[PDB]
Design an enzyme around this catalytic site. Structure first.
Site, PDB file in Angstrom:
ATOM      1  N   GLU A   1      51.686   1.751  88.747  1.00 51.09           N
ATOM      2  CA  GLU A   1      51.622   2.005  90.184  1.00 51.09           C
ATOM      3  C   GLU A   1      51.952   0.767  91.029  1.00 51.09           C
ATOM      4  O   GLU A   1      52.384   0.890  92.177  1.00 51.09           O
ATOM      5  CB  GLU A   1      50.231   2.527  90.550  1.00 51.09           C
ATOM      6  CG  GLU A   1      50.237   3.697  91.524  1.00 51.09           C
ATOM      7  CD  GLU A   1      50.857   4.960  90.945  1.00 51.09           C
ATOM      8  OE1 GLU A   1      50.113   5.774  90.356  1.00 51.09           O
ATOM      9  OE2 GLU A   1      52.087   5.139  91.088  1.00 51.09           O
TER      10      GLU A   1
ATOM     11  N   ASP B   1      56.617   4.766 100.082  1.00 53.84           N
ATOM     12  CA  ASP B   1      56.755   4.968  98.641  1.00 53.84           C
ATOM     13  C   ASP B   1      58.127   5.548  98.293  1.00 53.84           C
ATOM     14  O   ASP B   1      59.039   5.552  99.125  1.00 53.84           O
ATOM     15  CB  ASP B   1      55.616   5.843  98.083  1.00 53.84           C
ATOM     16  CG  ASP B   1      55.670   7.284  98.572  1.00 53.84           C
ATOM     17  OD1 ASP B   1      54.701   8.035  98.318  1.00 53.84           O
ATOM     18  OD2 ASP B   1      56.672   7.669  99.210  1.00 53.84           O
TER      19      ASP B   1
ATOM     20  N   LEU C   1      48.234   6.705  98.734  1.00 53.82           N
ATOM     21  CA  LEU C   1      48.904   7.367  99.842  1.00 53.82           C
ATOM     22  C   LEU C   1      48.003   7.468 101.074  1.00 53.82           C
ATOM     23  O   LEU C   1      46.911   8.036 101.009  1.00 53.82           O
ATOM     24  CB  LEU C   1      49.338   8.768  99.427  1.00 53.82           C
ATOM     25  CG  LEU C   1      50.231   9.453 100.458  1.00 53.82           C
ATOM     26  CD1 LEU C   1      51.649   8.935 100.352  1.00 53.82           C
ATOM     27  CD2 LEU C   1      50.194  10.947 100.277  1.00 53.82           C
TER      28      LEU C   1
ATOM     29  N   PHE D   1      46.271  10.904  88.172  1.00 53.99           N
ATOM     30  CA  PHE D   1      46.403   9.912  89.230  1.00 53.99           C
ATOM     31  C   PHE D   1      47.761  10.044  89.915  1.00 53.99           C
ATOM     32  O   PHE D   1      47.882   9.827  91.121  1.00 53.99           O
ATOM     33  CB  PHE D   1      46.228   8.501  88.648  1.00 53.99           C
ATOM     34  CG  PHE D   1      45.984   7.448  89.680  1.00 53.99           C
ATOM     35  CD1 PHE D   1      44.697   7.026  89.966  1.00 53.99           C
ATOM     36  CD2 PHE D   1      47.041   6.881  90.368  1.00 53.99           C
ATOM     37  CE1 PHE D   1      44.472   6.052  90.930  1.00 53.99           C
ATOM     38  CE2 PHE D   1      46.822   5.909  91.332  1.00 53.99           C
ATOM     39  CZ  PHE D   1      45.535   5.494  91.612  1.00 53.99           C
TER      40      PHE D   1
ATOM     41  N   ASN E   1      56.446  17.933  73.670  1.00 49.12           N
ATOM     42  CA  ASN E   1      56.374  18.883  74.764  1.00 49.12           C
ATOM     43  C   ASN E   1      56.429  18.172  76.108  1.00 49.12           C
ATOM     44  O   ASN E   1      57.204  18.550  76.985  1.00 49.12           O
ATOM     45  CB  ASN E   1      55.105  19.725  74.646  1.00 49.12           C
ATOM     46  CG  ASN E   1      55.320  20.978  73.816  1.00 49.12           C
ATOM     47  OD1 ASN E   1      55.214  20.951  72.589  1.00 49.12           O
ATOM     48  ND2 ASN E   1      55.640  22.082  74.483  1.00 49.12           N
TER      49      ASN E   1
END
Ligand SMILES: CC(C)[C@@H](CN1CC[C@@](C)(c2cccc(O)c2)[C@@H](C)C1)NC(=O)[C@H]1Cc2ccc(O)cc2CN1
Ligand SMILES: CC(C)[C@@H](CN1CC[C@@](C)(c2cccc(O)c2)[C@@H](C)C1)NC(=O)[C@H]1Cc2ccc(O)cc2CN1
Ligand SMILES: CCCCCCCC/C=C\CCCCCCCC(=O)OC[C@H](O)CO
Ligand SMILES: CCCCCCCC/C=C\CCCCCCCC(=O)OC[C@H](O)CO
Lengths: 447, 448
Positions: free
Chosen positions: B217, B226, B238, B310, B338
């Site tokens: 992050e 962002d 945010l 997150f 997957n």
């Protein structure tokens, strides 16, 4: 003795590796870094190139010596011969052009750093390779292999007409000695003997007495007061000691010849200075103690002497009898050490040093900052050349003497060993005699 | 062929020079500089001392090769041989102890403080030379030259009692093989397996969800737009999707507790980050599809799950029902496959691959600088050991094979000993590239 081969093997290897790895490193360091492409370096590149090419012929030299024959066939014979000859001519011509470069460098410290100077060097390098093609290419054509005598040995060599091989061989070898040695080496020697003269000439004429005193005494185009409070103007010209500005203007007007109102032009101030210098010189030659010292000094050191009279007068200077005789005996430091101990030094340290520095060095370095790089680079080139000649002289005389005359094969190989050693030495010399190479080698090999 | 001789001469030359010069340089550096006195380096010195000695024999070997005989007489014969053996046993025993020394540094840190010191390493070095002297000195005793029959060639070699000569040779060669290869190599293997196991074991205790998300992050203490253009702060926090910047500021000024003016301290960034993490975790436990999975997961993979929430949010993550099922069945690879099919993987590949790898390995390997697994110095030793083994394996097996059991293979013997010689000149180069200190001291020495 059993040690000979071992010692020779070892030495041989060191020379090959340093010669091959050394020069190849130099070539690259330059080609890559635009930061350092200077007249001198562009030549060194050419030099390293020739020296690298020749070093790769070592493993042929030895392997040939071991078998006592040429296994490599025609092609390789023709090639290493053209290398042999290219190296020989290329490196000597380069070194001559380097000297010539250094020669014109002493009078042009500005143009030395330009857009063209490095470019011209590039072009010259090529011209050298084209001229060297003369014998370089003819080595490719004449190069050939032959089975000699009953012995099963094979010889690699230039092939001239049979029987008259003698004349053509003698013809060529003499030409080699003329063009690849005699001419360039003498040209170089002349290049340096004259270069030291230009340097001596530049060390006197790089500064004048006017730039000197203008730094120590200053310059004013308007009446001002001394450090002792006296009215003065221009460069250390005392107008009067009496405390009347009207007197200073009066005295000043007599000095110039017009009504100045305490204001003089730069030109007028130069005329005044020149009169003050002459006056001081006449006073020195009238003085019993200074005259003989002055006559015996070079123009730069004279300037220092005049400088002192300017500041403290003729009588004030003559009291340095101990330091004066020392100058007259040309014992520069002894003089410098004594003068520093004087009261004159204590009360005006900065200026005093500049004068002493002049007396000691006999140059203007105290007043006119000189670039140490020109001397450092010039001594780089000089040494490289010096070493070359030492290393390549044995081989050039040995080939000449055998041809002109009618066992001893050991001498040949020794002479050969030098020429090879020279190629491994240069890379080292670049590193120790040029702090820019040392920094580039460092930053490249150990980042 | 005409080119072979050239190639060999050249390569032979560089091997010699770098070998003799490179190891001379190492010994000198180690000796003159206080910061170079370390357990490892004291071994290195001993090693380079052995590598330097054997290199002095190269010119003798090339000579005997060309003349085909031994011109140097017995005295030099007995000497050159003891060096052959000394070098062999000394060097290998050093690397072993070098490896062992590192094994202690990693698996016995407490004792390492007392054990790992230049002095103790010097003592051990000395022993290696006393040990090696069993074959080094006997080489001086059994060394000698005998003029061969049917030819005028002199032969420098070990002279056992004739008639039993063939068997003694074999006897010694086998013993040399066991002691100077198989055993040290084994020990080295054991050492380096015990290390990596404990490094792996520790590395997964040095990670956590926080450090993980700090990397994925990032961190910025002043407000920024962002990837989708929305105003953000600190660690992927945010503020708003409204493009006012004053609302972003108003959102930041609230929940921090002061007027920030678009700038926060790093401490405030964690306060927020910790809140976002707690929120993600609370999110997981309230979601019925994620909770049972979260519970069954180990600490490291739990972090992997928290990372995803997150990023894309509780609900978003719970849509990976097939992957979630496989994760609760501890079938990681099948699950990782997957997840790589998700749009999450296409939109943000770099991150996703790191997160998925974590689920795959169960470790923080995806969050390191590649081979930072082993330390600067341990890496060095492991490389120096490797090359050594690769280089000395050919000659060892060769000598042994011929001893048990063919005149054109002479070229093999020469290639095999070329690897040995070559290894001696490689070490100095490896020290420089794999150790900042050597690299540093070489610099000063070569180019002041
Ligand atoms: C290192 C330097 C000094 C060697 C390099 N060079 C390169 C070619 C060489 C390896 C060679 C080439 C062909 C056959 C052979 O047996 C040996 C062998 C002559 C050595 N250069 C020479 O020996 C130069 C010296 C010389 C001096 C005067 C002259 O008129 C012609 C020559 C040509 N050979
Ligand atoms: C660089 C390394 C790998 C060389 C160095 N060395 C040094 C001594 C030597 C030059 C030599 C010594 C005496 C006579 C001779 O013809 C050659 C020649 C054996 C080469 N050492 C060897 O080849 C080792 C390899 C080996 C492996 C197993 C075993 O039982 C004994 C030995 C002994 N020599
Ligand atoms: C040769 C035999 C020497 C025996 C070696 C004894 C082991 C000492 C040891 O365990 O190593 C710690 C050392 O101080 C880390 O460099
Ligand atoms: C050749 C093979 C040489 C093996 C040498 C050393 C490994 C054992 C080192 C000594 C271990 C002592 C036991 C001990 O109490 O260690 C405490 C703890 O491990 C401290 O971190």
């Amino acid at each position: 003795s059993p040690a000979i081969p071992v010692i020779i093997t070892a030495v041989y290897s060191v020379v090959f590796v340093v010669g091959l790895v050394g020069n190849s490193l130099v070539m690259f360091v330059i080609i890559r870094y635009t930061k350092m492409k200077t007249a001198t370096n562009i030549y060194i590149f050419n030099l390293a190139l020739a020296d690298a090419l020749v070093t790769t012929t070592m493993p042929f030299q030895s392997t040939v010596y071991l078998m006592n024959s040429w296994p490599f066939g025609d092609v390789l014979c023709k090639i290493v011969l053209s290398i042999d000859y290219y190296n020989m001519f290329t490196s000597i011509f380069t070194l001559t052009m380097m000297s010539v470069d250094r020669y014109i460098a002493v009078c042009h410290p500005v143009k030395a750093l330009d857009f063209r100077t490095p470019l011209k060097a590039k072009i010259i390098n090529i011209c050298i390779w084209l001229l060297s093609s003369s014998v370089g290419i003819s080595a490719i054509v004449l190069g050939g292999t032959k089975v000699r005598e009953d012995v099963d040995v094979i010889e690699c060599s230039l092939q001239f007409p049979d029987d008259d091989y003698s004349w053509w061989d003698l013809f060529m070898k003499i030409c080699v000695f003329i063009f690849a040695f005699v001419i360039p080496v003498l040209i170089i020697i002349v290049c340096y003997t004259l270069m030291i003269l230009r340097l001596k000439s530049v060390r006197l004429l790089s500064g004048n007495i006017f730039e000197m005193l203008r730094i120590d005494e200053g310059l004013r185009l308007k009446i001002y007061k001394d450090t002792e409070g006296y009215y003065t103007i221009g460069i250390g010209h005392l107008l009067t000691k009496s405390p009347s500005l009207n007197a200073a203007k009066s005295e000043l007007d007599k000095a110039i010849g017009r009504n100045t109102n305490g204001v003089i032009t730069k030109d007028e101030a130069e005329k005044l200075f020149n009169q003050d210098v002459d006056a001081a010189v006449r006073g020195i030659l009238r003085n019993a103690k200074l005259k003989p010292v002055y006559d015996s000094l070079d123009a730069v050191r004279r300037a220092a002497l005049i400088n002192m009279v300017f500041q403290m007068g003729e009588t004030g200077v003559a009291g340095f009898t101990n330091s004066l005789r020392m100058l007259q005996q040309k014992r520069w430091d002894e003089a410098a050490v004594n003068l520093a101990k004087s009261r004159w030094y204590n009360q005006t340290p900065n200026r005093a040093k500049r004068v002493i520095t002049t007396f000691r060095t006999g140059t203007w370095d105290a007043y006119r900052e000189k670039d140490r790089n020109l001397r450092r680079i010039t001594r780089l080139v000089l040494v490289v050349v010096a070493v070359f000649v030492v290393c390549w002289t044995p081989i050039h005389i040995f080939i000449l003497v055998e041809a002109l005359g009618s066992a001893a094969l050991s001498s040949y190989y020794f002479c050969i060993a030098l020429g090879y050693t020279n190629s491994s030495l240069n890379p080292i010399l670049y590193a120790f005699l040029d702090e820019n190479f040392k920094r580039c080698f460092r930053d490249f090999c150990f980042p």
